[PDB]
Amino acid sequence: MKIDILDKGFVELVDVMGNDLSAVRAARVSFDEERDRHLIEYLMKHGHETPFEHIVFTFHVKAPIFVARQWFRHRIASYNELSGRYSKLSYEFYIPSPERLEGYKTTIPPERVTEKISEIVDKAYRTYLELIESGVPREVARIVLPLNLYTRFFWTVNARSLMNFLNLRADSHAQWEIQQYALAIARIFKEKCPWTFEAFLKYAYKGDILKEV
Amino acid sequence: MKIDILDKGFVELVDVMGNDLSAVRAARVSFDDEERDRHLIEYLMKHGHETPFEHIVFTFHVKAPIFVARQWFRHRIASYNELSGRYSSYEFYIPSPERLEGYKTTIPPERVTEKISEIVDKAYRTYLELIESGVPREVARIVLPLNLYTRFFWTVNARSLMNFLNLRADSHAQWEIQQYALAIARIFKEKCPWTFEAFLKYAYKGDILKEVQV
Amino acid sequence: MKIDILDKGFVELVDVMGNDLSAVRAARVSFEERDRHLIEYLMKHGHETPFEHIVFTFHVKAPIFVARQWFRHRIASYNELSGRYSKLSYEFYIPSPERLEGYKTTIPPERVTEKISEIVDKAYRTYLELIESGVPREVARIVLPLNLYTRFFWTVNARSLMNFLNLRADSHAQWEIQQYALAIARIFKEKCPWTFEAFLKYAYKGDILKEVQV
Amino acid sequence: HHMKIDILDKGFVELVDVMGNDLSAVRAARVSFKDEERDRHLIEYLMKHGHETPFEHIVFTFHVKAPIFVARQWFRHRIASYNELSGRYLSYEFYIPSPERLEGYKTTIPPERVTEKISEIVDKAYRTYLELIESGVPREVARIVLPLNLYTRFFWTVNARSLMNFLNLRADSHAQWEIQQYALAIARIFKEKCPWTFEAFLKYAYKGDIL
Numbered sequence A: 001m002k003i004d005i006l007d008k009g010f011v012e013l014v015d016v017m018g019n020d021l022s023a024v025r026a027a028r029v030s031f032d033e034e035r036d037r038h039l040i041e042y043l044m045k046h047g048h049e050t051p052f053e054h055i056v057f058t059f060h061v062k063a064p065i066f067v068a069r070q071w072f073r074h075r076i077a078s079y080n081e082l083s084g085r086y087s088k089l090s091y092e093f094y095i096p097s098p099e100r101l102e103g104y105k106t107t108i109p110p111e112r113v114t115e116k117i118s119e120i121v122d123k124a125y126r127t128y129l130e131l132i133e134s135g136v137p138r139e140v141a142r143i144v145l146p147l148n149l150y151t152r153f154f155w156t157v158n159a160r161s162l163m164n165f166l167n168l169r170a171d172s173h174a175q176w177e178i179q180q181y182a183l184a185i186a187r188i189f190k191e192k193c194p195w196t197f198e199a200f201l202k203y204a205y206k207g208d209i210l211k212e213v
Numbered sequence B: 001m002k003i004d005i006l007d008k009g010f011v012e013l014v015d016v017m018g019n020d021l022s023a024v025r026a027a028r029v030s031f032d033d034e035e036r037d038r039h040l041i042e043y044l045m046k047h048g049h050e051t052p053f054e055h056i057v058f059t060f061h062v063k064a065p066i067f068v069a070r071q072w073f074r075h076r077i078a079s080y081n082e083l084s085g086r087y088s089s090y091e092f093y094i095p096s097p098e099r100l101e102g103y104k105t106t107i108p109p110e111r112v113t114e115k116i117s118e119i120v121d122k123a124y125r126t127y128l129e130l131i132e133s134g135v136p137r138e139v140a141r142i143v144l145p146l147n148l149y150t151r152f153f154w155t156v157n158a159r160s161l162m163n164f165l166n167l168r169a170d171s172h173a174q175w176e177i178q179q180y181a182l183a184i185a186r187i188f189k190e191k192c193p194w195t196f197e198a199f200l201k202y203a204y205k206g207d208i209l210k211e212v213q214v
Numbered sequence C: 001m002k003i004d005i006l007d008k009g010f011v012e013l014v015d016v017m018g019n020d021l022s023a024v025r026a027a028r029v030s031f032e033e034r035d036r037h038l039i040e041y042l043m044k045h046g047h048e049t050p051f052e053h054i055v056f057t058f059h060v061k062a063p064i065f066v067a068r069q070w071f072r073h074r075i076a077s078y079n080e081l082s083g084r085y086s087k088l089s090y091e092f093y094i095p096s097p098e099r100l101e102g103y104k105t106t107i108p109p110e111r112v113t114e115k116i117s118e119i120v121d122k123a124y125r126t127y128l129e130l131i132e133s134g135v136p137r138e139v140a141r142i143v144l145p146l147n148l149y150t151r152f153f154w155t156v157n158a159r160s161l162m163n164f165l166n167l168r169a170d171s172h173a174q175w176e177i178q179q180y181a182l183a184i185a186r187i188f189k190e191k192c193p194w195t196f197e198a199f200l201k202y203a204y205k206g207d208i209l210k211e212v213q214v
Numbered sequence D: 001h002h003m004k005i006d007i008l009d010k011g012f013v014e015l016v017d018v019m020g021n022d023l024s025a026v027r028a029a030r031v032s033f034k035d036e037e038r039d040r041h042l043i044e045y046l047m048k049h050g051h052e053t054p055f056e057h058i059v060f061t062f063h064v065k066a067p068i069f070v071a072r073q074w075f076r077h078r079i080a081s082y083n084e085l086s087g088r089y090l091s092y093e094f095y096i097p098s099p100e101r102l103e104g105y106k107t108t109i110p111p112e113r114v115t116e117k118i119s120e121i122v123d124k125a126y127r128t129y130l131e132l133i134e135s136g137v138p139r140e141v142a143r144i145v146l147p148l149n150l151y152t153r154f155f156w157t158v159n160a161r162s163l164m165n166f167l168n169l170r171a172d173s174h175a176q177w178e179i180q181q182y183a184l185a186i187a188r189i190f191k192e193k194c195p196w197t198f199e200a201f202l203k204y205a206y207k208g209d210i211l
């Protein structure tokens, strides 16, 4: 299960432990269709969040550094990001689409904005290459690369922390770029834990976008 | 996969996410070679790169005396769900004479076991009586002894589990929790043999897991 | 500041880092009505991170059944007396007859208080017989009841402290820990008045702190 | 607090506040409310046997100004609290490595020219940023063209135990030189405020080498 985000990014499900019933078993501390869902909604509405910590996901994410920086602020989770000492490195950059600027009356055509960004990216990247070729270590030369450079990471997180992530990132107040990733995370969450996801939207979700999309 | 511990306790595996390769994939940040994969596991363990092992997760169902659970619950990097004494088998851990078969006492070890059993029976009886009288469970239960068995679900990742083993699968820890740590270690070994072996070889700070098999 | 709780317990403030302004500085990231205005803004908009920069260290004496509920709050630091090696005062929480006010019981409340006291006496006396006989404390103490008082140090930041209050300073929590939560709230209010008020007005999810003064 | 240490060309690590000192760990370990000799002995005992929880009762709050590539590595330390400047909503300064930063590395061009080339691309990226902002482009979008050597600022509250883990990982020759410099500043302040704990740390638990 993979979802493409932005121009070159993505969110892919690597593994998952449990499902809605994992939270049910944990809540009852042990080991009926309607009875189980009722328990899930009960836990959600009353704020009994601990049982959902027993559902865990591992995602593989490709996102721009500025998005990853905001993402990594979520401390109750595990991350492993690219370094280039265990796997090969790649150089791609997030170039906003003209549509991304819709809504703002910019004196510069949204098409020209996309071009200027692409322009600087190319120049920074070429400078980077020029430095490496001259013998400058990568850890130094890389500092000239822009924040829109794509990176990749593995993210393992339990359902409770995931719902906190959605509360903050699947919201109109969050930067549009991370909103997109949050939407993809929500879709995968819904596919693996439909009962929990539904209960979440109904009683605990604090954001807005998940109720519109 | 369930292992009996003490007189009425146990450690049961409920679920597990991943295996040794999960840490390998995480370290390389790649989703998609035994010799080299096992070498990487040893390398990570040897140089202290522990984050990759956080991508292996276990969920256990444990039945242990409260005095043991209190020590267990001090391990904060994990998730717990315990039986609610306020809302809810009423069983207790009675040490066998063999548990004292090592200290010099003024009374036979068997006598100690009898004394413990006796007071537990009296406390339990008092509890049931209070409950019969309409006294709320949350109040009546305060007379129950620390050897009362409780149960909880424990979800923990491999890195945190290894920290648990470093501290509890050791002769300095109380004998009772050592027994549970041994069972946790056995299940860990079965599901992640490569990580477990690398752990014992490069990072394990305790003593018993290098003396006792599986 | 030492506040007495229950019959022999207490909550004592050991140390504190910062005040309301610590959160303001953190939110602004730079080392008054406008400042207080900011605190309220943060609280109403859900900006909780700035309050993580205010930290408290408390010394608490409480019955084990209360401590176990307390220790479920993982985002904090704890150091408690050792049941295996620490010297204890051997004091127990005996509910007052008023504790059962409201519950229709077969026997009178004073009777319940009496029975609890009797079982505690028997358990304690049995414990004494074991220790005097040579039984190690780590084993002998398992017969002691859950109402035995213990002590611990608790270091926690304001954000986690507020989460603790949301859960324990509430009618759904056991009356005994509610009492401790009230004391914690009292100390929080004295050191961080602006944050405390903003909390009650915008984020507090409990009920008792909106009716019980300070 | 008040302590401040300059790092790199425009960065710094400033001590904002501190709760406790070495005695805070001693009291927590004994879980109560002796003498200097026995107390320092207890600190070494704790450090030696890995009884690290008592040190969680010592807390620091730092104000740090560092380039984003350094901050990114720093923020991987989850057991701590952070508050950083929002790029979405500064004085825009950048870390320009000194020619000496390339000592030991045989480069095709003079080290001075490398510093120049870095300064040049940074200038072009910044000027592009300003042009986008002036045209009405949202800051959150325009800022993505800025380089990783852009300076940011943040408050960091962390306890002594977590700080020691931070030092074991960053105060090491295997860490990038830039973060090593910051780790040395953190260690310096730690030493100043908790002499006993720091000394014990260096003697029995520190796994790095530069300290």
Ligand SMILES: Cc1cc2nc3c(=O)[nH]c(=O)nc-3n(C[C@H](O)[C@H](O)[C@H](O)COP(=O)(O)OP(=O)(O)OC[C@H]3OC(n4cnc5c(N)ncnc54)[C@H](O)[C@@H]3O)c2cc1C
Residues within 6 Å of the ligand: A076, A077, A078, A079, A080, A081, A082, A083, A084, A085, B051, B054, B077, B157, B159, B160, B163, D076, D077, D078, D079, D080, D162, D165, D169, D170, D174, D175, D176
């Ligand atoms: C030379 C060098 C190379 C590096 N290479 C890479 C790389 O290739 N990829 C990469 O992603 N990072 C890399 N890092 C960053 C490394 O992963 C960091 O040290 C780590 O992210 C932060 O450390 P920590 O886990 O010890 O600290 P904290 O996150 O602050 O945690 C402190 C302690 O609590 C723990 N802990 C916290 N949360 C959890 C949890 N959820 N589960 C289990 N235990 C937990 C552990 O016992 C830990 O030591 C590198 C660092 C250095 C110095």
Ligand SMILES: Cc1cc2nc3c(=O)[nH]c(=O)nc-3n(C[C@H](O)[C@H](O)[C@H](O)COP(=O)(O)OP(=O)(O)OC[C@H]3OC(n4cnc5c(N)ncnc54)[C@H](O)[C@@H]3O)c2cc1C
Residues within 6 Å of the ligand: B074, B075, B076, B077, B078, B160, B163, B167, B168, B172, B173, C075, C076, C077, C078, C079, C080, C081, C082, D053, D056, D079, D159, D161, D162, D165
């Ligand atoms: C032989 C023995 C004797 C003991 N004696 C005592 C005693 O006298 N008094 C007592 O109270 N307890 C005692 N304990 C219990 C001890 O406090 C526990 O081992 C500890 O609380 C749980 O371990 P941990 O911190 O390593 O694990 P976890 O809480 O699971 O944490 C794992 C890692 O994340 C970390 N971490 C998590 N949270 C924080 C945080 N807030 N700040 C900094 N780092 C953090 C550390 O790197 C840690 O190793 C004893 C245990 C043993 C085995």
Ligand SMILES: Cc1cc2nc3c(=O)[nH]c(=O)nc-3n(C[C@H](O)[C@H](O)[C@H](O)COP(=O)(O)OP(=O)(O)OC[C@H]3O[C@@H](n4cnc5c(N)ncnc54)[C@H](O)[C@@H]3O)c2cc1C
Residues within 6 Å of the ligand: A073, A074, A075, A076, A077, A161, A164, A168, A169, A173, A174, A175, C049, C052, C075, C157, C159, C160, C163, D079, D080, D081, D082, D083, D084, D085, D086
């Ligand atoms: C629109 C928007 C604007 C933002 N602006 C800024 C800004 O200007 N500056 C900035 O620094 N960040 C900013 N952020 C980041 C914001 O602080 C993140 O939501 C936060 O860092 C990650 O959330 P968390 O604390 O809820 O999650 P996690 O770190 O994953 O924690 C989950 C839960 O555990 C908790 N928790 C974890 N660790 C601790 C701890 N040490 N102490 C107390 N509780 C803890 C809380 O209950 C928390 O909700 C912004 C985010 C958004 C969406």
Ligand SMILES: Cc1cc2nc3c(=O)[nH]c(=O)nc-3n(C[C@H](O)[C@H](O)[C@H](O)COP(=O)(O)OP(=O)(O)OC[C@H]3O[C@@H](n4cnc5c(N)ncnc54)[C@H](O)[C@@H]3O)c2cc1C
Residues within 6 Å of the ligand: A050, A053, A076, A158, A160, A161, A164, B077, B078, B079, B080, B081, B082, B083, B084, C072, C073, C074, C075, C076, C160, C163, C167, C168, C172, C173, C174
């Ligand atoms: C009326 C009442 C009834 C209760 N009944 C029961 C019961 O039947 N069984 C039982 O076991 N407990 C029960 N509890 C205890 C309940 O589980 C506690 O509230 C909880 O253990 C501690 O709360 P916390 O998660 O909010 O806090 P903390 O552990 O201090 O965490 C603070 C924040 O960080 C978070 N966080 C920390 N660690 C993790 C993690 N590993 N994964 C995801 N998020 C994390 C969350 O955002 C959290 O709110 C009850 C409590 C009350 C008040």
